[PDB]
Amino acid sequence: SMSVKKPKRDDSKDLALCSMILTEMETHEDAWPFLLPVNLKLVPGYKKVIKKPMDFSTIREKLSSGQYPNLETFALDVRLVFDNCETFNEDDSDIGRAGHNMRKYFEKKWTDTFK
Numbered sequence: 165s166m167s168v169k170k171p172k173r174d175d176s177k178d179l180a181l182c183s184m185i186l187t188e189m190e191t192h193e194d195a196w197p198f199l200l201p202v203n204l205k206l207v208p209g210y211k212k213v214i215k216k217p218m219d220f221s222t223i224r225e226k227l228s229s230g231q232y233p234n235l236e237t238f239a240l241d242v243r244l245v246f247d248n249c250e251t252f253n254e255d256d257s258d259i260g261r262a263g264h265n266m267r268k269y270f271e272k273k274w275t276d277t278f279k
Contacts, residue, residue, distance in 0.1 A: 178235040182227060185273050189242070190220055192269060194262040198245050214252060218244040235278065242270055 189195060201219045204211045223241050225231075232238045249263030 175235070179227075181277050182232070182235055182238045185270070185277065186220065186224060186227060186242075188273060189266065189270060190224070192266065194265045195220065197249065197259045197262050198266065210252065214248050216244060216248075218248060220245070239274060243267075246270075 190199070198220050200221050202210050202214070202217055204217075210217070218241050223238070223245075226241065227238065232241075246263050246267040249259065253260040253263065255261070255264070
């Protein structure tokens with residue numbers, strides 16, 4: 165509260181470490197459904213159903229331009245990618261499997277780096 169602060173957790177490496185994680189996700193073989201924004205002109209249903217589209221290129225631009233205030237807002241956008249994938253794709257489709265694999269991969273890197 166006012167003039168009473170918890171000890172300072174060192175956040176000075178967070179930007180570099182989120183950039184490394186994002187590089188690992190970009191280069192994974194199962195990243196292909198997630199590299200670019202879904203084409204809203206060509207994919208029926210996507211625009212109306214998925215209220216907040218998100219993809220790795222969009223997260224990389226946000227990250228490079230100071231649009232994440234902290235490491236939690238970065239993790240929220242990465243999870244949004246996989247949450248959108250589960251909403252739109254059956255679990256037993258190639259894209260649905262890719263999204264489960266990538267989520268698992270991310271969450272392990274997240275825990276190992278920051279927790």
